[PDB]
Structure 1
Amino acid sequence: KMILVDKVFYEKILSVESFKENIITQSAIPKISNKEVRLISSGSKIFYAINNTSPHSHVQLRLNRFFLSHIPLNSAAKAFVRGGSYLKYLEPHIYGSSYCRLDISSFFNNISFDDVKQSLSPYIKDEYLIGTEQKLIDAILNSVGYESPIRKDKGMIIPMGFRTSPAISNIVFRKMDLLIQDFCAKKGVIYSRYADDMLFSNPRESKLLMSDYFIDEISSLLSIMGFNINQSKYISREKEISINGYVIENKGGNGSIGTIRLSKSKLNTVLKVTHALAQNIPYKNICNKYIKVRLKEKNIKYESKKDEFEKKYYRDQLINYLGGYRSYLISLVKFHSEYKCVNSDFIIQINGILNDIQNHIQKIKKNRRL
């Protein structure tokens, strides 16, 4: 059964108490004002963060929990979906002999709010929420949307960092997921997508992924809803590709299965951290030099104790990092054990690295008590 949110659904399950006053007084639910949104700057990107105290944050979180998670998606979208992962995004391409990787320029900034309304309309009842002033769908879009004060020209914009932006992006892009999947499959190409990053692989022996025709066709398909291809990130290669560190390799021809491993670039930081821990260089230097984690003096919670606090914090950061990298590598190991697509020698290297990490973690936890 397709999900359908109506006025009673919004009043009881979604609004709860966040917008009780606005729903009893028959006053229109207002836009997310600039007061509730802070603007962080990360490189050339700008991130929008809403305050938790605002009711908009609560309604957005509950919207993610109860409504957006029920709308069906396309199987080629391996990002922000229940059970999806990067390894699942790379896996279907082990059978391919040639690889192509494309990117979408400003995926979240180019999502038109009109497309969002058209996508979410069939799953929301066409009722009037507040008298004959505001519609239910418009109120929900008020919950999910925003106007960037930096760029007032576009008006409604879906910003990165919100509660609901990734899932809404997936739902609005399901249309292009279907179109590109149909095109690639009729061409015999395996297609998958993680956020804005699209990966195609041709298992046959052909130059299709290397020609300009393929890029032209994907750009033509993306142009329907106004997207563009980032030409700086376009990659095409044969028999192996090194996608952001993850290396896929398939030398064979008919009926060959490739292998997914990790390049030395990915292992560089963890190997250096293990070597430094074996070298007995202090935890502060390890955290600062390689991990870029530090305890700023303004972030000291209490002035009762400082040196012991800093030692405990650095130990906590190191234990957390080692646990996290171990978790990442066992994610790789489980992916191998369930799909059987990771290089065997790389599996041996992973096992050795894991044993070293566990020995270092045991040494750290033992030195904690001394």
Structure 2
Amino acid sequence: ILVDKVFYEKILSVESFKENIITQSAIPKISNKEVRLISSGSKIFYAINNTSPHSHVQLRLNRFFLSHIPLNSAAKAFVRGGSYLKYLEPHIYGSSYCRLDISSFFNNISFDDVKQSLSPYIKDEYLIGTEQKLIDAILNSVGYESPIRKDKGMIIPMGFRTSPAISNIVFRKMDLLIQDFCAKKGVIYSRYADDMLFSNPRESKLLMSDYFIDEISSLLSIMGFNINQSKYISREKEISINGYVIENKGGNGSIGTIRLSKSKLNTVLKVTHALAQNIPYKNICNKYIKVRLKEKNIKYESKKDEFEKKYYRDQLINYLGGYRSYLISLVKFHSEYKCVNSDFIIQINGILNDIQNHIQKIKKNRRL
């Protein structure tokens, strides 16, 4: 794709910035009065106003522009058809497993790297007179000058709509380099967001050596990225990643299996047990699940003891339906690839039957 002046005049900016084009005025940047500063632990999330000229431009860029630039198959995050299960699937054929993480992935993306990556797909011309270029005008809708990070200048912040696509486009080069490095060693490599998973099917201690870490660090130093030394895992014949267990006993032509730990399913089992023991829905929805109806959210008093009950029932049924959808997604993944343990399949079939029975009982009780 090659975006020209008319494309930005009609498609990218149909009505938001049409006033600034005929008047021959430069496109303004995003001011500090239009972005929120949500905080979560040691993380800062930037939220833009839902009614702003830049939000519509970002959505149009995401749908029409940042969806056709080719990517690398090793990236399985924020891409249509990608999933965590597809991120774990290729490593079932390996006997040794290694995991790596990138420290401050979004905060360390250089803006000039983004500009260079997006330059070939944008025509080199002046959008507004002889003062502002088309590339700069497009790029002013994705960056932000962080008041807390003025030392680093302006960066692409997490919480915007166009950040993941830009991250994938920027990191395509590093993905290609790492894949080329791993191909010669016979190591399967996959990436989800900023997490890298490496699998070795042969009997060797390459993944447990410091040489692999040094090589990955040297590769990542071209674009200024660093690894996190507190999240380095290297094991053999079994690995656990956020409750997903991948096992392979070893041997020539051996196929591993993927299952879920018991701790991964602990909350749903507790909810099912509480529901089968006739526990009030308020306690179930407040203790196990983190859903609570604050009194401030109430707008009109009207009637009191009829909306809380239906709200809690809807939240419970939505939670159960979502977890059922997750389990049947696992079942569909098994049907497509056949890399799931049989006993786990029996267990999840029983759990699905129990969940469906509980949902039917909840619906019948609500109707009565």
Superposition TM-score tier, normalisation by shorter sequence:
over 0.9
Q: Which runs of 5+ in 1 are unaligned?
A: none
Displacement after TM superposition at 1:27 (Å): 0.8
Displaced runs of 4+ in structure 1, greater than 6 A? none
Displacement after TM superposition at 1:368 (Å): 1.0
Displacement after TM superposition at 1:250 (Å): 0.5
Q: Distance in 1 between matches of 2:175 and 2:135?
A: 24
Post-superposition Cα deviations, 1:243-292, rounded to whole Å, max 9, x if no partner, equal 01100000121111110100111111111111111111111111110111
Q: Percent identity?
A: 100
Aligned to 2:191, the other structure's residue is in SS state strand
Displacement after TM superposition at 1:336 (Å): 0.5
Aligned to 1:200, the other structure's residue is in SS state strand
Q: Distance in 2 between matches of 1:191 and 1:244?
A: 18
Post-superposition Cα deviations, 1:100-133, rounded to whole Å, max 9, x if no partner, equal 0000001000011111001101011111111111
Instruction: Give the superposed CA RMSD.
Output: 0.7
Post-superposition Cα deviations, 1:346-370, rounded to whole Å, max 9, x if no partner, equal 0111100100110111111111111
Q: Distance in 1 between matches of 2:137 and 2:283?
A: 51
Q: Distance in 2 between matches of 1:143 and 1:277?
A: 49
Establish whether residue 163 from structure 1 lines up as the match of residue 161 from structure 2. Answer: yes
Post-superposition Cα deviations, 1:275-331, rounded to whole Å, max 9, x if no partner, equal 111111111111110111101111113221232111111111101100110111111
Residue of structure 2 equivalent to 1:358: 356
Post-superposition Cα deviations, 1:186-236, rounded to whole Å, max 9, x if no partner, equal 110000000000000000100010001001100110011000001111110
Aligned to 1:153, the other structure's residue is in SS state helix
Post-superposition Cα deviations, 1:157-187, rounded to whole Å, max 9, x if no partner, equal 1111101001100000001000001111111
Displacement after TM superposition at 1:68 (Å): 0.5
Displacement after TM superposition at 1:28 (Å): 0.7
Aligned to 2:311, the other structure's residue is in SS state helix
Post-superposition Cα deviations, 1:138-165, rounded to whole Å, max 9, x if no partner, equal 0111011111111111111111110100
Establish whether residue 74 from structure 1 lines up as the match of residue 91 from structure 2. Answer: no
Q: Distance in 2 between matches of 1:138 and 1:66?
A: 18
Q: Which runs of 5+ in 2 are unaligned?
A: none
Q: Distance in 2 between matches of 1:305 and 1:222?
A: 60
Residue of structure 1 equivalent to 2:192: 194
Q: Distance in 2 between matches of 1:302 and 1:112?
A: 49
Q: Distance in 2 between matches of 1:275 and 1:16?
A: 55
Q: Distance in 2 between matches of 1:302 and 1:60?
A: 36
Aligned length: 368
Displacement after TM superposition at 1:20 (Å): 1.1
Q: Distance in 1 between matches of 2:250 and 2:204?
A: 13
Residue of structure 2 equivalent to 1:18: 16
Displacement after TM superposition at 1:61 (Å): 0.7
Residue of structure 1 equivalent to 2:174: 176
- Which stretch shows the higher mean deviation, 280-289 or 91-100? 280-289
Aligned to 1:199, the other structure's residue is in SS state strand
Q: Distance in 2 between matches of 1:194 and 1:117?
A: 23
Establish whether residue 5 from structure 1 lines up as the match of residue 3 from structure 2. Answer: yes
Post-superposition Cα deviations, 1:35-81, rounded to whole Å, max 9, x if no partner, equal 11001001110000000100101100111001001100000000000
TM-score, scaled relative to structure 1: 0.98
Q: Distance in 2 between matches of 1:226 and 1:306?
A: 57
Residue of structure 1 equivalent to 2:129: 131
Q: Distance in 1 between matches of 2:303 and 2:69?
A: 51
Q: Distance in 2 between matches of 1:321 and 1:87?
A: 21
Q: Distance in 2 between matches of 1:219 and 1:306?
A: 60
Post-superposition Cα deviations, 1:12-45, rounded to whole Å, max 9, x if no partner, equal 0110111111112111111111111001001110
Q: Distance in 2 between matches of 1:24 and 1:259?
A: 62
Match of 1:283 among 277, 281, 284: 281
Q: Distance in 1 between matches of 2:342 and 2:33?
A: 54
- Which stretch shows the higher mean deviation, 299-308 or 261-270? 299-308
